[PDB]
Amino acid sequence: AMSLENVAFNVVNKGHFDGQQGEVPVSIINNTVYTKVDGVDVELFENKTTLPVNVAFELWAKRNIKPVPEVKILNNLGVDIAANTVIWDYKRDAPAHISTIGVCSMTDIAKKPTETICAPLTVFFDGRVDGQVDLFRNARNGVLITEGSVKGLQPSVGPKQASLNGVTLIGEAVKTQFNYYKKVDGVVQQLPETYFTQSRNLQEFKPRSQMEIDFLELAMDEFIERYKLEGYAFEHIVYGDFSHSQLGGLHLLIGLAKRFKESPFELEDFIPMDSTVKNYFITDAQTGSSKCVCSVIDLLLDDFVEIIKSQDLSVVSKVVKVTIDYTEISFMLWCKDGHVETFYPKLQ
Amino acid sequence: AMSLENVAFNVVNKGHFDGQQGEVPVSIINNTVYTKVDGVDVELFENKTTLPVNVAFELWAKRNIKPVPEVKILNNLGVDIAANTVIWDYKRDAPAHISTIGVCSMTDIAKKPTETICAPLTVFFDGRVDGQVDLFRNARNGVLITEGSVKGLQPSVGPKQASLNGVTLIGEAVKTQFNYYKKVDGVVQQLPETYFTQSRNLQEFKPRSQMEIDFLELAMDEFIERYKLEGYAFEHIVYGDFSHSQLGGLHLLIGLAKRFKESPFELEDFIPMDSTVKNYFITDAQTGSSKCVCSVIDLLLDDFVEIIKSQDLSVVSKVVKVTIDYTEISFMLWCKDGHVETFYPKLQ
Amino acid sequence: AMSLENVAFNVVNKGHFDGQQGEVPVSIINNTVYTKVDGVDVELFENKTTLPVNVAFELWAKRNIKPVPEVKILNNLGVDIAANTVIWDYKRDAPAHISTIGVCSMTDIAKKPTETICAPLTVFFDGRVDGQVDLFRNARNGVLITEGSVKGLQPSVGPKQASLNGVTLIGEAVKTQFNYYKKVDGVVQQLPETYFTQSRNLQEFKPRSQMEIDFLELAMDEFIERYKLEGYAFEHIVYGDFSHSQLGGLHLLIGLAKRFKESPFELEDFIPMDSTVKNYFITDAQTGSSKCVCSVIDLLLDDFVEIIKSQDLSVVSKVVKVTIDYTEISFMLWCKDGHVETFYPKLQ
Amino acid sequence: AMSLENVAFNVVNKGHFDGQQGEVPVSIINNTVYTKVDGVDVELFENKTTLPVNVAFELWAKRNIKPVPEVKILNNLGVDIAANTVIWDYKRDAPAHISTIGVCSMTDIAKKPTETICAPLTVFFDGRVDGQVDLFRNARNGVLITEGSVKGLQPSVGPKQASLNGVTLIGEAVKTQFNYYKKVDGVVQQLPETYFTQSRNLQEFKPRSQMEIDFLELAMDEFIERYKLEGYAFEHIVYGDFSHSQLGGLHLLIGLAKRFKESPFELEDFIPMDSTVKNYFITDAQTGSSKCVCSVIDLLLDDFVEIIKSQDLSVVSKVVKVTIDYTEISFMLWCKDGHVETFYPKLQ
Amino acid sequence: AMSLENVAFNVVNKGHFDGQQGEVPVSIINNTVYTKVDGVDVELFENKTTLPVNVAFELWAKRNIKPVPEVKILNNLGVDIAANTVIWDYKRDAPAHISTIGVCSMTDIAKKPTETICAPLTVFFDGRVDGQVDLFRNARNGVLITEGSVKGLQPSVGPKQASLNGVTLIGEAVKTQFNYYKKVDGVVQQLPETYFTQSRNLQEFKPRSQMEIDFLELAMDEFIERYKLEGYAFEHIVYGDFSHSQLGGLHLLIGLAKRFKESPFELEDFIPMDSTVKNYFITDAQTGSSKCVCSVIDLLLDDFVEIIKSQDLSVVSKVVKVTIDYTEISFMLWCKDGHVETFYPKLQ
Ligand SMILES: COCC(=O)Nc1ccccc1
Ligand SMILES: COCC(=O)Nc1ccccc1
């Protein structure tokens, strides 16, 4: 017995839709959902989606409040829809997927993932919910996350971090590292050997290794000496060249974080969404060095060192494909006389 | 257990809110309420009010679908709120009154008219509903309509016509003439001797008397002779003078209707609302004669003849107050040498 | 001392902005201007313009309520702005010109037409207003309309009809035929010999000549015989061919009107604006004959007969330029063996 | 002589409505109020209210710019309307009260608080304004704030802090501690003995006592030892248990502030308004411990210690009512074997 | 071949409009521009302008991404339009100028600055673009910026800082100091000797001189002693008097920055735009001292000391005009007994 006023009552009394009975008075003005609290209207939700306000409100209220995979992982694994939940995209303030299965009467394409309409879609299944591993086994397409082993099914250990209510974190009081499974046309697919992005913020960047601790602490010349990175263009790629009108390199988040402590810079996120490789219009505030499209990836510095040191340096131009977050990321490797000139997450 | 989807279900299945159980999927985009009917969205309501869309939708759904007094009568009698109903103002596409009593959780000031907040307001009571005549008895301020005699109370016979779903009509299969009662600070009032406006349309004008039948049939010179209206400026007041750049007179609807059969004209209703006297920006298309503010009243021609023939014609300028629709309408009477020059419902 | 509430007061009490002092309470929700009349909000104006609501409200209130040239004439004569008035475009529900001169603080480019900013613009001047004929004299570029003779200047007799509050009419109680004058870079121009469109409606079409009276009364074969129009393709051009999937001809409004009395049809006005030649997506309901772009002009049938009979019929395809409403309208004349096949106002 | 352009002129030239004469050009597009400053439009106000844009703009301009009681105190004391001022709710970006008395023509229910419509409403009176203490004496219902003593009337010393233009502060150059008075049905009401919340921010939290200074400085085990709080569940209630998937306790703002310095956490304020007890959807960023509804109160730690130490610890479950900010706040006290298990501001 | 989808493609792939060929799917809902990225809609632009969404989107995409003069300098120099570029006003999130020259089909008044419509407008020319110095020479009105000398034309050395993508900076990898030229009615105008504002933020304030370094480091009494500023009211003007209900002085940004480190304060920017003198509604959080209109200028403290020390101190009240950012800023100088009482950027 779903209603706007019942969804609103749940938001007001439980913090989210908890299936409790009751109604509060609601008013909808434009794209904002308000409720009457002691004579005056209080804003409950601002529609930042392309869906009708009341519809978005319901999906936001019915959002999954358990640690879930980050939208980039779900996209990289080809997920189209979720089974009886709403994965909320906090980077976009909108549902991660267009339609729902057993969530909202307006967005539902089916009540159960077993309906023939879900067969061609990659449905996301959560093994922590009862009967969802069995629904994955019966699905034609899908992705499954589990906390433990599923007999017979070969696991793929996912990232240490997961998104809990928009807060990406490595769980201590909750499990955030999941086993991942994928199915394409009824056939379980072997998920590749992958690297994971660290999902760190530029503002609250924290090193997750001795190499990362030495990068932020030591000077450029002593770090490149200690970790024997001579001839790998770390000065351009990781550190960034701010001497010309076009900002050179700066494609690793740890390098952006090191610079950020010395001087600020504008990072214009012109495509705001969760992505393995993020593109930014960077403008350095100190020098005035800028780049319209600066591809930035957040790999662990040890993983990025391993990737670049595992390359053949004898070709002038070469595309280097690296599996990161289950997706193949093409990099552009430019060499000269057996040394790296540039290495960057390939644009276009 | 009121909800947006339950109100919508009632509209879809019963034509209005009939208190039936059930929900249909709803989407609200801007000021329009839509429902999903077989995969596609169908518009159910367009908010033309100053209230939130969903709130106005509920009040529109909960509108009184029985013949009710016209909003002008209700306003003229000082009605502030209705008892457990919504009088819908079809001339304004909005509720006739700001707040409700036992209708909508958002607009309700009380659930029952007996709550102390309704004591100072003039609450409209419908005697056709059970216990409302007794609620009028207990109420300090209010207006009561009844179909029949009310023991003790002295009636005021209201107009022959009432508004049934926006259609103003003189009932044949329903009762539309009501007995009116009014109470101010606990005292039953003696409602004044009043004339009633006929609430006719310019397009579908129909004569309600032999004088009105003779006005539309005979020529100006013959009618003024037959009804001995010489010296009463009927040529200017009722018939209208279209010989100069400012349209002369034309203040009675029957005169506008006689004109309309021959020549069409633009009537710009710049204050769209139900009023005893209506103001129009008229532009005659045949001649180009025009008036920015042309006050138009729809009295029965016999009643207008009686009003004008009961005036002293010895003063150049005089305000003539006439009780019409329980309100005092001031008219401006201009004379010269014992004859009328003009007589019109006083503007501003 | 211009204000939103003062403009609103003028609309409520005078029908338009009449420079009277006073304020009424106003509320603006979206694109609608409302006022509080006895506790409830009444809609005063709906913004159908690309200007801010309150700005368009003021310009609409300050609209010229005297018979003015039709927007098509003003456009055809290169008018950019009006002198201390607002020509309201009722076909577009928006001001005919972007900026104003001494009307609204938001849209004003100058307070007086003598300011250097108005020198390059073609300013419209109304000779009926005091000093405007002298303002035309001092103005470098402009169009002047007068009711009578202007000493020195040679007149151009304009159309019989003018627009009074959106009602296009040939005045009887007002002057609608104006003398036209034009100045380009300080030089008074000799306005060309022109035909005028009649500005008639399809619904209320009235014949303005014996030929037009005979067109609507007689049958196709009798009319073409009486007026010796054999070989001029009047059957296709004026009468219209409804025998194939593409509606043949039908470019003269009198022919559309003759049809309209017998069979109705859809005229989709896909470019809603005042134009000498109007384009329509016509769908005949009786036959199903249709044309995506059907150019329709409303010339007097005697004038259209004169135009077509004054053409050389020896070329297969030829562009025929005809001055109508002071603008050059290109027509497409198609002949075969010394007779007209088609003649139509050239599209795109 | 109130107008949109006059309100706008005052905002532009005085920072707020200061009753100065003059008009600036205004444009209203959607919910934003703009003014023309040197050819371009500058945004003056963004309507975040449920009122019409121009109406909200006027109330925002006419906001009380003197230190006023915080909206929570005004709500807790039953205030419905203010006398000839607008208390602006900065937590909601909207007027604290629906209607006004002598402020805006659109929202006014009366010009003076002595009108019979204000009799049943609790009107807020400011003793610092001339004649307002006399208006409180004559009012039927109301709340009065004064800077000094009012002869005969028994005072209630309010909080040290007040809101000056949205900045909650304890005045140094202004008086912020007021004497409070209340009237219900003509009878002055004795305001209860109350505790006051400190109105501190989580970001800029500053200790206001030696106990608070010792809480933020000392470790959990030495603070609980120094202040003899053994057996009072301060570890769970104040400090917070972040070891399980549901965040334990954490109901005092000082405890949230202590945690905040070690690691961040998301506090989702799902009901954004000024309240004595605030509810939050807290997600700990370090551990991943979370609570959908975490009631948080900001009492001085000495006051919270006094409240919990004044309780009978012999019952398993008990409701403990504590007067805070003139309102009765129910707490839930859970004990076992003569010791506290939990104590929290009771939800539902 | 300009289009909405082509502009969107450029934003998505290049970070801004780079004239590249291609289209992405776009959806416009209200004032937001979205694109479909892998099945879901991602927001690309939020219209904060008074222009149509798609129009503003194009101008934002076509914004000048090279260091440009700050909007205040451009306004102070009378700039009306830019030549074949869009100066984006980041303080207003809107184009700095209403119309364009060769940028957008909707906003263009001309394709080239040589069209007669641009003659009366002060067109901004960028000497770094080919042929723009020649277009300035041929223009009637305009402002020209150049990186080097233009033969014959006498330069005006502009500010050290320029705005690169909204980041105001003193270039290191780019040139930000430009030579300035102005033309009024075909005649080059001598730009006056001027001071420049420093364009610093209150949050990230950095001293640009030994005097500024000593102001922020030394106490009020030792700074005024070291720089011999006794009798110049620096305690009131620069330092600010927070002892009374009206905040005294505080008109220099360095003084606001010194205070900001000790305690916070609300600066309500009620006219959000780039201005030489900025007006703020300041509320001191510590004391509760406030000022509705507090004019704040950001001069180098050495320049402000030079201005105040170059004044005659023998008059009670005097207007002191100082050329800053090419505009004349009137200050109000109040003296008594040969000493300054106050000196502030004159309001009204
Ligand atoms: C004290 O007010 C009088 C009244 O309401 N009398 C009445 C009302 C309803 C029916 C009969 C009598
Ligand atoms: C230099 O322009 C000629 C002109 O305007 N002549 C005129 C204008 C108005 C009335 C009589 C003569």
Curated annotation (Swiss-Prot), chains A, B, C, D, E:
Looking at the UniProt record, the site noted as Transition state stabilizer sits at K291
**Could you say which residues are annotated as the site Uracil recognition site?**
S295
Consequence of changing H236A: Complete loss of NSP15 endonuclease activity
Per UniProt, residues of the AV-Nsp11N/CoV-Nsp15M domain are: 64-189
The record's remark on the cofactor is: Likely affects Nsp15 binding to RNA.
Name the cofactor(s) required for activity, per the record: Mn(2+)
- The record places the active site at H236 (proton donor), H251 (proton acceptor), K291 (for uridylate-specific endoribonuclease nsp15 activity)
The effect annotated for T114I is: In strain: Omicron/BA.2, Omicron/BA.2.12.1, Omicron/BA.2.75, Omicron/BA.4, Omicron/BA.5, Omicron/BQ.1.1, Omicron/XBB.1.5, Omicron/EG.5.1
For uracil, which residues are the binding ones? K291, C292, V293, C294, S295, T342, F343, Y344, P345, K346
Q: Which reaction is recorded as catalysed by this protein?
A: uridylyl-uridylyl-ribonucleotide-RNA = a 3'-end uridylyl-2',3'-cyclophospho-uridine-RNA + a 5'-end dephospho-ribonucleoside-RNA
> Where does the NendoU domain start and stop, copy by copy?
206-345
Task: Give residue ranges for domain Nsp15 N-terminal oligomerization.
Answer: 3-63
Query: Where does the protein end up?
Result: Host cytoplasm, Host perinuclear region
Subunit and interaction comment = Homohexamer.
What's this chain's function? Plays a role in viral transcription/replication and prevents the simultaneous activation of host cell dsRNA sensors, such as MDA5/IFIH1, OAS, and PKR. Acts by degrading the 5'-polyuridines generated during replication of the poly(A) region of viral genomic and subgenomic RNAs. Catalyzes a two-step reaction in which a 2'3'-cyclic phosphate (2'3'-cP) is first generated by 2'-O transesterification, which is then hydrolyzed to a 3'-phosphate (3'-P). If not degraded, poly(U) RNA would hybridize with poly(A) RNA tails and activate host dsRNA sensors.
**The protein's name in its UniProt record:** Uridylate-specific endoribonuclease nsp15
Biological source species: Severe acute respiratory syndrome coronavirus 2
Q: Which residues of the full protein are shown?
A: 6453 to 6798 of 7096
